[PDB]
Structures are given as C-alpha cells and as structure tokens.
Design an enzyme around this catalytic site. Structure first.
Site, short mmCIF file in Angstrom:
data_model
loop_
_atom_site.label_atom_id
_atom_site.label_comp_id
_atom_site.label_asym_id
_atom_site.label_seq_id
_atom_site.Cartn_x
_atom_site.Cartn_y
_atom_site.Cartn_z
N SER A 89 -31.88 3.05 -59.50
CA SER A 89 -31.24 3.59 -58.30
C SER A 89 -31.57 2.63 -57.14
O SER A 89 -31.18 1.45 -57.25
CB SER A 89 -31.69 5.02 -58.15
OG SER A 89 -30.83 5.56 -57.18
N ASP A 188 -22.54 10.74 -62.62
CA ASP A 188 -23.73 10.60 -61.83
C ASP A 188 -23.41 11.31 -60.54
O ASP A 188 -22.41 10.97 -59.92
CB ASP A 188 -23.92 9.13 -61.53
CG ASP A 188 -25.20 8.79 -60.79
OD1 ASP A 188 -25.54 9.56 -59.85
OD2 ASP A 188 -25.84 7.76 -61.11
N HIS A 218 -28.14 10.88 -63.31
CA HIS A 218 -28.55 9.78 -62.47
C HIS A 218 -29.91 9.23 -62.84
O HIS A 218 -30.15 8.00 -62.80
CB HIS A 218 -28.56 10.26 -61.01
CG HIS A 218 -29.00 9.21 -60.09
ND1 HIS A 218 -28.25 8.04 -59.92
CD2 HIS A 218 -30.10 9.12 -59.28
CE1 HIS A 218 -28.87 7.26 -59.01
NE2 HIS A 218 -29.98 7.87 -58.58
#
Length: 242
Positions: A89, A188, A218
């Site tokens: 991320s 996601d 995610h």
C-alpha cells in the site's frame, strides 16, 4: 506490541515496507517465508505506527520516508549491497520512490495507490483504524466511545502532505527501470485498482510483470491468498540478476 524485524540469512536482501496505519506485522509472514528461502529481510516501523493511534496523527510522510531511507541504509551498512524492495500500500509507493532514488535490484509494489482520496475520507480511515485497534485491545464498547470522543478532537494535519506524496510518485514512475512486479487485489475497497495498470504501464522497466489476486482484499499479505503471493514473490526475486 509490534516491533521492527531483521532476519539475516544469505547475501541477497529484501527491504519490506508496511502501509499507512499498518506495522511490521503486516509483512512478518512474508519475511519468515523469504528467510526460509535464504533471503535476508528487514522491515522497519514508521513513526506513529505500531503504537497507540493517538500518536499517529502527529506524524506524516516526511517522517515515514526518513524511516524508509534509514531502513535501506541499515541493510547497506550491514554489508548487503544488493537490495530488492517489497512494499504494501503506502509502502508500495515508497518502494517505487526508492526504485528511482537509490540502487535496488527489483521492486514489488503490492496494492499501492496512485490516486488521491479526500482528506475527510483519509481521516475516516484513521478513525476506523483507531477503533479497530481499541477493539483488539478488548476494550468495552463504552470505553471505545469515550476514547474516540477524545480522539476526534485532534485533526491530522499531515494528510494533505500524503495526497501530495502519492501524486509526486505517480508523476515520477517513468524514472523507474528496475524490474518491477506489480501485485494487486482485484477487489480492493481501500484504493483505486486502476493504480496497478498505471504502475505497470508507467515504469520504463524492460523487465516487469503484473498479477491480480482474485479472492484477496487490500491488505493482501494478511489475506487468504498469502501462500500463493509468497511463492510468486520468491519466483520473481529468483529471476533477478543480483
């Protein structure tokens, strides 16, 4: 309480970077897996992370980037010259930034965002994190409410700087030539999945690949397809020229 980790194995090293509101636990299973395959691993914890959520709101991407760079230098300083970077991320955004900033052998951004949520939406995300954290502390719903009452009195002023960070790296990914493996969960709900195609298409890397994880969310390192992800990352790292 989560802490950074360093597993020293063979001469190939991997820097593992966690996401915003995350911590080194999010990459620990991947670290143990890579260590078992002979790769040295190091995962830092960003400032304001891996501590009570109250401390996060006083930190921002300038702090977190220092942690990332200090982690890279920690590996270098221990004599590991050849480093691949794998990041979840926001850590994936920092992976990309290291990829055009310092020498790396390869980059694996996992569910890294290339676009901007609003400050309000990002703040709501912090609130969710704070409540989830207190739930995991086993606090009574009443106690959580009183704590979140207090928490909401302080804004997080560094969120505009995070928006700006994402746009800055988006606009520099054409400087990347390192081998890149883009990893993305298909559904996601935290980021725009068009990010994955943006990275894949936007780097100048001659060597690159992309894989979609069809049943994951995610936080893909903690999710149900981690075994496959581990094998795919290893296969990628094995294919590189160290």
């Amino acid at each position: 309480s989560p802490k950074p980790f360093t597993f020293e194995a063979g001469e190939r090293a991997v820097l593992l970077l966690h996401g915003f509101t995350g911590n080194s636990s999010d990459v620990r299973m991947l670290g143990r897996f890579l260590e078992s395959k002979g790769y040295t691993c190091h995962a830092p914890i960003y400032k304001g992370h891996g501590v009570p959520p109250e401390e996060l709101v006083h930190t921002g991407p300038d702090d977190w980037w220092q942690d990332v760079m200090n982690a890279y230098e920690f590996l270098r300083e221990k004599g590991y010259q050849k480093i691949a970077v794998v990041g979840l991320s926001l850590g994936g955004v920092f992976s990309l930034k290291l990829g055009y900033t310092v020498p790396v052998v390869g980059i694996v951004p996992m569910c890294a965002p290339m676009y901007i949520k609003s400050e309000e939406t990002m703040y709501q995300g912090v609130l969710d994190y704070a409540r989830e954290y207190k739930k995991r502390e086993g606090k009574a719903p009443e106690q959580i409410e009183k704590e979140m009452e207090e928490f909401r009195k302080t804004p997080m002023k560094t969120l505009k700087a995070l928006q700006a960070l994402i746009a800055e790296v988006r606009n520099h990914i054409d400087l990347i030539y390192a081998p890149t493996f883009v990893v993305q969960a298909r559904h996601d709900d935290m980021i725009n999945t068009d990010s994955a195609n943006i990275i894949y298409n936007g780097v100048e890397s001659p060597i690159k690949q992309i894989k979609w994880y069809e049943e994951s969310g995610h936080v893909i390192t903690l999710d149900k397809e981690k075994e496959q992800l581990h094998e795919d990352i290893y296969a990628f790292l094995e294919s590189l020229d160290w």
